[PDB]
Structures are given as structure tokens and as C-alpha cells.
Symmetry: C3
């Protein structure tokens, strides 16, 4: 494999994070005051790393940080039940851990933390975060196994109720690549609706990484993926492979949802910077 690959983990990492009310009524996470985004920033770590997140709630209401997939003690589960949220103006240090897979004392096989995960609020509006999630308090988390193939770029597409990344209908987002780039999609669903994520001109493997290990990998190959509230998956594709440059649609294939605006463009450019037909 002459492609870049993930190294072995085991670092202790530190991170400051804020929750911020945005001028338009939304709420968003950020690594710096004044730089919050919806989706929130991407967190990426290696199996076996530990992450300490000093989280500050700059909002006028209680807020929290709850994560999927990774190891965390009950003091870091981000629920009010377990006294794990943060009052207005407060600050709390959450700890997430990850581990490599391996053999248990009893001979069984313990799975590792690697995968396409996510984090979101758990106490704004209700004790399940219905208000925070709706306002934009969600973001992606990636845990890499040693040897995993690394991309040229990562993009995050979140189906939040009937919007993509909390955008107005029929406003994308759109992404650009050049034929040949190795592009990574992290795909997360939130809210109360069910969807199917479809991408013209490309396909991926329905397994942890989106890639086949080789001629023996039994994972099915798909271009349409059903998803419900709090599902998360990811894949990599070679932009334009076998199909060439173009304005390639991605959307929810639910005919009502795409009619209502859940559509965007994956713009794959020729080497001269152009898109066939434009």
C-alpha cells in the first residue's frame, strides 16, 4: 500500500471546546470563541489515544457533550441524570478513551473503538438534547485503526430532520474535488425522520471503513444507504473513478425529502478546473 496509513495510537491529547449561541438563533460547537460551526469541528484520534476536552458553556442555558462509540466513564456521559452537564458560563473537563481490539482473558475477542462516530448535546430543550440537536449542537468523531487508509480530505454531511447541515432547502452544501482525489465522507443522521443517502456516479462498501479489504471481503457494495436518528457511517471514494468529472448529485432518495430540498452537489473537476457542461 503506497497510500498514507494511520499510525498506532496511545497519545494523551488535550482540547478546548466551546458551546456558543449564534446570532441567528442556532447553537454550535467550536474550538475557539467566535469560530463555532454547524456541524461542529471534526475530532480525529487513533485507537488507544485518550482525549481530555475542557468544555466551556458560553450559553445562557445548560448544555452538554455526549459521544457515541468511545469509552467514557459515567461522569462524562453528558446527561443531567448523572450530573454531567454544564451550567451557563461553566466549564467541565470531559474524558474520552479508546482502545485497540484484542483477546480477553476468557479467550473471546474484544472489539476496538475504531469507526465513524459523533458527538452532540444531551440537555438543551429536553433531557435528550432535542433542542440542542435541532439548533446545531452536533459534530463528527473519527477513530482510526492502525493501518487505515488516510484521505485527501474529509467532508461531513448531516441529515438533521429535513435539512442538510441545518441549511435552507436547496442550498447544498456543495463540495469540490478533482478527478482522482481520495475523498472521505462522514455521514450522520439526527432528529425524528428516516432517510436514504444516495450518491450519483459513486459507490462504497457497507462496512466499517467503506472500503473492501480485498477479494475475500464479503461486504456488500451499495450507493444507497438507509439511516435513522443517530446513525453514523463513513466511506472513501476515488472522485470520478470510472465515471469522469461532472456535477454529481447526492441527496436523500426519499422522493418527498428531495423534492423538499435535501439535495447537494459533489462537483468533480477536470485537471483544468472545469465541470463538464459549464
Amino acid at each position: 500500500i503506497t497510500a498514507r496509513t494511520a499510525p498506532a495510537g496511545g497519545e494523551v491529547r488535550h482540547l478546548k471546546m466551546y458551546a456558543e449561541k449564534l446570532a441567528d438563533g442556532q447553537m454550535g460547537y467550536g474550538f475557539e470563541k467566535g469560530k463555532a460551526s454547524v456541524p461542529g469541528p471534526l475530532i480525529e484520534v487513533n485507537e488507544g489515544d485518550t482525549l481530555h476536552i475542557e468544555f466551556t458553556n458560553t450559553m445562557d442555558v445548560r448544555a452538554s457533550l455526549h459521544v457515541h462509540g468511545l469509552d467514557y466513564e459515567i461522569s462524562s456521559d453528558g446527561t443531567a441524570m448523572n450530573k454531567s452537564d454544564v451550567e451557563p458560563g461553566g466549564t467541565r473537563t470531559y474524558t474520552w478513551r479508546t482502545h485497540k481490539p484484542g483477546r480477553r482473558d476468557d479467550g473471546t475477542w474484544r472489539p476496538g473503538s475504531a469507526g465513524y462516530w459523533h458527538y452532540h448535546d444531551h440537555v438543551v430543550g429536553t433531557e435528550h438534547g432535542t433542542g440542542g440537536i435541532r439548533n446545531g449542537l452536533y459534530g463528527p468523531v473519527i477513530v482510526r485503526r492502525k493501518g487505515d487508509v488516510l484521505p485527501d480530505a474529509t467532508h461531513t454531511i448531516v441529515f438533521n430532520d429535513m435539512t442538510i447541515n441545518n441549511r435552507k432547502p436547496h442550498t447544498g452544501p456543495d463540495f469540490e474535488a478533482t478527478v482522482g482525489d481520495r475523498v472521505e465522507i462522514v455521514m450522520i443522521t439526527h432528529g425524528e425522520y428516516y432517510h436514504t443517502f444516495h450518491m450519483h456516479g459513486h459507490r462504497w462498501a457497507d462496512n466499517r471503513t467503506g472500503i473492501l479489504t480485498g477479494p475475500d471481503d464479503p461486504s456488500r457494495v451499495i450507493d444507497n444507504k438507509i439511516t435513522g436518528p443517530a446513525d453514523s457511517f463513513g466511506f472513501q471514494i476515488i472522485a470520478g473513478e470510472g465515471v469522469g468529472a461532472g456535477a454529481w448529485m447526492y441527496h436523500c432518495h426519499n422522493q418527498f425529502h428531495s423534492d423538499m430540498g435535501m439535495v447537494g452537489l459533489f462537483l468533480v473537476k477536470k485537471p483544468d478546473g472545469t465541470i463538464p457542461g459549464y
Copy 2:
């Protein structure tokens, strides 16, 4: 592997079962008169066993027994069409069979019966059992393969329309374990809604057993699983592994269903019997 494992099957087994109207209007199965439950009792067998169920309908309406996954002849399919239901006060012997996997005459591979299955009524209210299922006429079936790892306890969680196990909203059920136990969950969905099953602090393999065979198993690891009417899956987790004791929520992650009461607690205790915070 020094954990307990399932033995090879091939026994002929016998069982008495009743359907019973409950005093509150619900309907349930049981192995003894006066001891019906919702969910009905768990039936567990080994690939290759045969099960003869003498089923007695003690209700004032027709009722039946329909099973997923296992081999049954058309006389045991539990539909009114094939004249397989049971008149009020009547009795009928259903036969379910299971087989091991193996090579067919043509060289192809016949799959075995092992899996997490379920049984439910097919004629109460409509000819698809909409009334019986609504009332509580459903229960889990587990078929084990030789060598499967055996748990310390098994619990059944059924999303029935917008309830868990037909309970009133926000009334559990809750389960208890001690840090370290091998806990097995059978997860079944019924009715007319779609859900996603999420469990704080734990994860599992999205394959038949919920466990990885080893370093070569391509199965993805998840903590959130989409499910629709009559889907059934199962898994095992080590209670508290890598995360410790605590009151860990499980729920449907659909924000509307969560807010409406589809929540419960998986209470993992320290050895002294306590739960951090209580």
C-alpha cells in the same frame, strides 16, 4: 475459549403454551395458566433440535403462533389462510425444526437456523395479527450454533409501536448487572413505527451474534441500530467494560420517541452493590 459454549443440538423437545387474556385488557403467552407475560417466555434451542409445542388458546377469540427463522411446515405457519390458528378454548400442536449448515448436493452452502428470532400471533384483530401483537402476543426465540458463547443472563427489549415491552411511557423497564457480567440482549421491533436502538457506554458487532470472531471479522461495530416491524437482532456485552459502573441509558434515539417515553436504564453496579451517584 474458557467461557461456556453451546453444545451440538439434535434433541426432540416438548413444551406446553397458553394464550391468556389479562385482567387489564392485554393478551399474553405463558408456559403455565396464570403465568403469562409480555413479552412471552423465551424459547431457546440448539441448531438441529425439534420443538413440539402443544398450544392451548384460553381466550374468547381465535389466536395463533407464528415464528420467524425456524423451519416449519405449512400446517404450522399460524395463519387463518392455511387453517393453522386455534379456535377459542382449542388446542393444537405446532412443530418447529432447526438444522445445522452444510454443503448441498450441488456444492452450494445451506445456511443454518441459528439466530435471534421471535414468535407472535397472526390472527387476533386482523389476519396479520395486528390486534394480538398490539395486545402483547409476542416473545423471543434463540437458536444457538455449536460453539456459541453463552451469557450470564438474557434480557428482552421489544419496541412495540411507541412502547418498550408494552409499558407506560418513561417506566423502563430497567435491568441490573454487576461490572463484569456477560449480558445478552434480544431486541425485537413490532407494529407500525421505525426506531433506532441506542445504548450508552457499550457497543456491539452488527452481525448474527453481536460478537467478533477475531481479527479477521469484517463486521462493523455500532452502538445505534435502525430497526423496523418484525426485525430481530441480538448481542452480548461485558457490562461496564472499559467504562465502569453507572446508570447507563438505553433508548430509541428518535428524538420524538425518546421525549415520548422510550427510555430505560441498564444499571451496572460495583461489587458493593452501588451505582455511582446513588
Copy 3:
């Protein structure tokens, strides 16, 4: 394997296809004027084949051909955006390509095209084909890998909104087989609803082919599959294997949908041509 298997592909193939308004208001595809069907005709090819489709729109509105899974250039994506629909009475030649899996320059493994795919309209009624799809402009596409087991017959079941193959409620379709036949189902969902496809008496592997490769295939075995708009899977079963002849129901297991008509019969006959009870 002394069953029939797919050969290696690589042919260039040609096809004439029409879109046609039906006397009852529906629309459908066909290989011959006067012979359109809903679902449209099955297209089947071998990994590595190329397919040239001369498509003629005989209707009084724009129509197109969009396909899942296969390789196509942006000129053949069937969207109005990319100027690849067909005006009334017009003709256009779409090109679909497929490739075998294999090792990329960087050492990664490129997936092949094989699978259970489908084609449908993209511009009738809306720019996502909501009108064409609802009217009947959809059909199945099968791409075989060298070595794949071949069936005795293939049937196409499409859950389109709350109909099967656009039929009136409780009107099938029904299919007939004889105990022992190798039967292949192609299962496609369209519209705005979610379903679960269930088949009495039979089960299949939840992977690309529906079949297990042998003792090491980790794929789970199911008889109930959740599906949303534009999902497509397929499988093979041995009619009556281990369960015998009979009138076996298949349906959507959503209790509302089957009460409302989404039911058909898979009639498995004894060698004398009869069905237990009829």
C-alpha cells in the same frame, strides 16, 4: 459446484428501450412498443460488459433513464441538470459500463460493479422523477460476478409507496414454483415510505448475493429486511427447502401496510402441481 455459474464478462451489448404512457394513466418501460411493463424489463449483464441503450421517449413529456451502481459518464446520468433527459418523441443513447474488482496502483482494492441494482426515471413530475416513479417508470438491473450461482427463475418485487408493483391492494402479485427450484428475488423500494420485507418459510443471507460462501461467511441470516426509498437487494432460496409445499405469504411486516394490502403469495407446488389445502 455442479450448479450453473455466471461466466466472465466483457461483451459490448446493445438494447432498444421505450417509455410509454399506458391506457390507464401509468407509464412504463419496454423493449418493444406495445409491450411495456411495470416493473420494467429486467436487464442482466456480467461484470465487465458495456451496455448501449437506445432509449426512445414516446410520451408527451420529458423522461429519462437513471441507473444505480453501474458506471456511467455524466452525459448518461438522466438528470435535467446535466442535460441528459429526452424530449417528447426523442431518442438518446445511454451508455452503462461495469468493471471487475482488482488492485489499484496504490495497493488498495477497487470494488467491482456486481450486485442487485435498478433503473428509474429522473424528470417526470419533478426533477427527481417523483411522477415517473409513482407512475411505474422503474425496473431491475442485475450485474453478475464470474462464478455467481445462476437461478431457475428471477422475480421482481417492488414496494412503491404502499403498493407492490403498482397493483391494487390485496392483489398480489403471486408467483409459482415447485419444491426444489432455485428461485431468485430482486427486491426494490421506491417512493416516500419505509418497509420491512418478510417471507414465510424461507430465509436468506444479508449480503450481496443472499447466499453464504461457506462456513466462514460472517453474514447474518434473516427473513425480515428493512428497506427505504431506492434500496435494492436480492437473494436466492430453494423453494420449500426443509419446509415443503404450500401457499407461503410474503409481505411488508409493517402492520398498517399489510392490513392495507401489501401482501402476496409465493405458491410452492408439490410435483403433482398441487398446494397443500387446495
